[PDB]
């Protein structure tokens with residue numbers, strides 16, 4: 497084999513031999529086609545310290561970006577997590593209105609290996625974005641929102657933390673929800689509106705909202721984008737008042753109902769999650785939210801909750817570098833950087849009519 501033959505010369509060239517005077521032997525190269533993070537296993541007599549000392553040389557020799565070098569099952573075996581020099585993805589990519597999709601309902605979240613990541617909300621209607629504080633899971637949601645505002649959609653924004661993440665400029669573009677009573681009224685309305693559109697399609701004999709809009713002129717239904725900053729504000733019922741938790745259990749009722757029956761009604765949920773918990777990302781939320789955006793999660797348990805795999809732990813530590821799952825396949829992408837005080841121009845959306 498070519499790889500074993502290649503690696504052998506790279507080691508001979510570095511005189512990278514153990515106490516036994518023998519070069520590391522390649523046990524397995526497990527390449528990921530989706531994330532494109534390869535897993536290079538070697539068993540040598542060289543200690544993990546000497547390996548780490550050689551990461552800059554090993555990168556230049558094998559032409560790889562070493563994500564991590566860890567010790568395997570035995571103190572003889574090492575595992576390298578890397579990406580070839582050809583798995584080229586920007587380390588930083590800002591937002592540009594040039595990316596805004598023409599097709600009403602298609603949104604672009606960033607750049608991948610082969611092209612850009614696109615989500616058609618007529619096909620995949622709900623997005624679950626997850627990541628630690630400062631990962632940029634909010635940035636994505638704001639960018640999806642901007643693209644939909646530009647597409648002329650109705651926007652609702654949920655942030656129970658005084659609505660600080662949805663400032664006075666966001667307020668101009670749509671309704672901002674800050675309390676459980678407002679969220680109760682909003683989610684009840686969203687279920688009623690979803691059901692209202694559900695019968696219009698039945699009666700009109702139209703597949704989606706677009707197929708009805710081309711049948712009724714002055715009665716055109718606009719897309720509804722409802723972004724939730726922290727699912728846990730609606731999910732996590734622990735601590736609140738006896739009357740407040742009946743309100744939260746109603747919000748949870750309506751949310752489940754929204755995610756389940758709103759593929760054709762053009763009502764979309766974009767949910768951010770800081771702390772992936774099974775009490776928050778319920779199987780009802782999982783079964784009905786098809787789009788998964790995942791930041792680097794140190795734990796294997798938090799990644800399984802989100803992606804239904806342990807891929808988030810192998811993410812190269814790059815600000816805005818996420819994982820993307822839709823259906824079975826899981827891919828690596830660099831999320832566009834959406835700067836609020838650079839790209840969010842609320843008057844450009846008010847001009848739209």
Ligand SMILES: Nc1ncnc2c1ncn2[C@@H]1O[C@H](COP(=O)(O)OP(=O)(O)OP(=O)(O)O)[C@@H](O)[C@H]1O
Pocket residue numbers: 588589627628629630631632633634635636661725768815816817830831832833834
């Ligand atoms: N795509 C990106 N490229 C480069 N840097 C990024 C990117 N996304 C985020 N960052 C940086 O990290 C910061 C984190 O911002 P952000 O508020 O979106 O993250 P968050 O804490 O996970 O979400 P939230 O506000 O909902 O708590 C950004 O302000 C920016 O400095």
Ligand SMILES: OC[C@H]1O[C@@H](O)[C@H](O)[C@@H](O)[C@@H]1O
Pocket residue numbers: 671681682685
């Ligand atoms: O929050 C619910 C309210 O949202 C508004 O955008 C609508 O115009 C109202 O009809 C609705 O009752």
